[PDB]
Write a protein that binds this ligand. Structure first.
Ligand SMILES: Cc1ncc(COP(=O)(O)O)c(C=O)c1O
Ligand SMILES: Cc1ncc(COP(=O)(O)O)c(C=O)c1O
Lengths: 399, 399
């Protein structure tokens, strides 16, 4: 009678969360954390938004029960999510073509979609950008879906390699899923232009792909409406699509696990039938979603006063990151870098895709206490006026 | 192209949550909800516990960040959970043989265990009592495991058919998983005696089963410590086991999704190896767990004044249920019931397994607006002094 657990092989360290554990153990003073994608303020803290504290006070005073939510969550949360994604007067909403489930974070939204697709459709293959968020492959693989990669990044020109993207998707077949980052591509910070989105939408329709949009950073590139332009170009042309969205980043609600999975089908009767199977997949996973974080978001989005506060707080975050992008480039020059880092100013969202080699990233960590992901992704939102100079001195030292 | 969603078949309604939806839509003022397992107070509401409101006020005023929890959640939540399960000074805890992940509810803990087993071991088969919670089969099937049923309930004598149980489980092979309800069996309310638990534990080690305890009602049978005797008898003999537990019921925290999956192995090295793969399975599901509910539970359990308030609130809930069982039995006789219902007194937890037929349950709902599950399971915790009379008049009318 040998033990059931004896033949288990240890899992590898998560490329992002294993980094964050190393950083916590490091005892060297002055260490700098440019790893995980969270927003830091000017003092290096990860604060709760004021709009969120105000919403949480309202809930504390007014909640009378913790009775279970429905499988698909708070209804108002679903409607505000759809207006945010598709626009206040979208035909998708007027025609009742979309159904939304509240999920535990953006990850949970991706997993719900993966389980739904694997069990209820003939989808066998998901295409994701190379590079992408490392956990994408794991999520779809957990449902038994094959994941293939398409080309995306021109590391020479620090731009979208649109020609290779198109050519590498040639073998994606009708009924395959193709995953797009809605904005603030993780890790490159490089998003298609409106014209490029429009070309992709047309191509997707011709080849019969099922688009799946991952929206984790709406509002961090240019603005809430502008960041949804690519999705809305797809939505104007497609009968069917799926959107996984997260409120972790744009509400600073990381650990309350607030996200949404939105299904779009050709008509109301089809999406309702499909959605009943999405609800069945949720029920066999976590039963029904956590209320606190989604209640906060729904409270903020449906109160005009609280929403105006939140939109300003999100603008402040976006602008601080853009200021740090510019200060990073300038200080690298000041500190003696001969490599041209000006492409960082053109990149969107929390990160810059710097180009450092695995070996240089390792040197930064072991020698200077500066923590980036081994792909060379750095969280610009982790840079402050106080840590910018030592950070840049370290980078110049390993170049 | 023909759409990917066009041929999806609609899912059937959930036997518990579908009933709850019918109940909400029912326009009759006298309707009575005895379906889903939630606690009502004697005024018919589903309240937030006072310990919980106090903890939530502390969190509101002292939380400074929503930064991601680790994959396995709040550390003190894990330690307090192990202490509740195994006892203040257990050898499992002192030998560092146990690891706990905070999960989204008890359901989430079951799915995490199921995914972990399916993807990392040779387990193919899970054995569940007939009857059981209906969602058990769905969770394990969705992870790819086969579900087999063992006998449990003697319907003629309203008792545990221990001989039938032992005999059906002789077909369970070594390396199979056998699922036990820790206490307050759902739906029958009939638990093993301590002697019977000891017999099963011995039989379990000799046959090589991997036990999986589902603990959703610790504290509702006799007491926090007493209700864990059966699990602690298993833990004294086995090298390996899994406990999925829930704080939904005993904290009235249903919609915040607070549960735990606890892994036990033969030694510290093996459990840390196995737990690394459990974390991988979590990372590809919801990434990390929701903070608010678990923070509430950890604040209560780690503060002596709050814990004392909570333990009294749980005692009051348990005792109110016991008063309703007796009142239910006495009132049935007063309303003209032909049959002996005294076996209801011998059942533990929120429910009673009434023995009504599906056709009688259907009549109760359609003619009398009394909502019970089609199995005849009734939620005694939904009974109040004000609804007992019409409730019992309706039951007598359909006998
Ligand atoms: C592209 C992308 N998708 C999904 C996620 C996961 O978001 P969440 O924390 O809400 O699960 C992230 C970041 O965490 C992300 O960058
Ligand atoms: C035996 C059993 N296991 C698990 C659960 C699920 O607990 P939770 O709501 O926390 O997911 C329940 C009741 O809901 C239950 O009765």
């Amino acid at each position: 009678h040998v033990g059931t657990f004896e033949n288990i092989t240890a899992a590898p360290a998560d490329p992002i969360l294993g980094l964050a554990d190393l950083f916590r153990a490091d005892e060297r003073p002055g260490k700098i954390n440019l790893g995980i994608g969270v927003y830091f303020d000017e003092t290096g803290k990860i604060p709760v938004l004021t709009s969120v504290k105000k919403a949480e006070q309202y809930l504390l005073e007014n909640e009378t029960t913790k009775y279970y939510l429905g499988i698909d969550g708070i209804p108002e949360f679903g409607r505000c999510t759809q207006e945010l994604l598709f626009g206040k007067g979208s035909a998708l909403i007027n025609d009742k073509r979309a159904r939304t489930a509240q999920t535990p974070g953006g990850t949970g939204a991706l997993r719900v979609a993966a389980d739904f697709l694997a069990k209820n459709t003939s989808v066998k293959r998901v295409w994701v950008s190379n590079p992408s968020w490392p956990n994408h492959k794991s999520v779809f693989n957990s449902a038994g879906l094959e994941v293939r990669e398409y080309a995306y990044y021109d590391a020479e020109n620090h731009t979208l390699d649109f020609d290779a993207l198109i050519n590498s998707l040639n073998e994606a077949q009708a009924g395959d899923v193709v995953l797009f980052h809605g904005c603030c591509h993780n890790p490159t910070g490089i998003d298609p232009t409106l014209e490029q989105w429009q070309t992709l939408a047309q191509l997707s329709v011709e080849k019969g792909w099922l688009p799946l949009f991952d929206f984790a950073y709406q509002g961090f590139a240019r603005g809430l409406e502008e960041d949804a332009e690519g999705l809305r170009a797809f939505a104007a042309m497609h009968k069917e699509l799926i959107v996984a969205s997260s409120y972790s980043k744009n509400f600073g609600l990381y650990n309350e696990r607030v996200g949404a999975c939105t299904l779009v089908a050709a008509d109301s009767e089809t999406v309702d039938r499909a959605f009943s199977q999405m609800k069945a997949a949720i029920r066999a996973n976590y039963s029904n979603p956590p209320a606190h974080g989604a209640s906060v978001v729904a409270t903020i989005l449906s109160n005009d006063a609280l929403r105006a506060i939140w939109e300003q707080e999100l603008t402040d975050m976006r602008q601080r990151i853009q200021r740090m992008r510019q200060l990073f480039v300038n200080t690298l020059q000041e500190k003696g870098a001969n490599r041209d880092f000006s492409f960082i100013i053109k990149q969107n969202g929390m990160f810059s895709f710097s180009g450092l080699t695995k070996e240089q990233v390792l040197r930064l960590r072991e020698e200077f206490g500066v923590y980036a992901v081994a792909s060379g992704r750095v969280n610009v939102a982790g840079m402050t006026p106080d840590n910018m100079a030592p950070l840049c001195e370290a980078i110049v030292a390993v170049l």
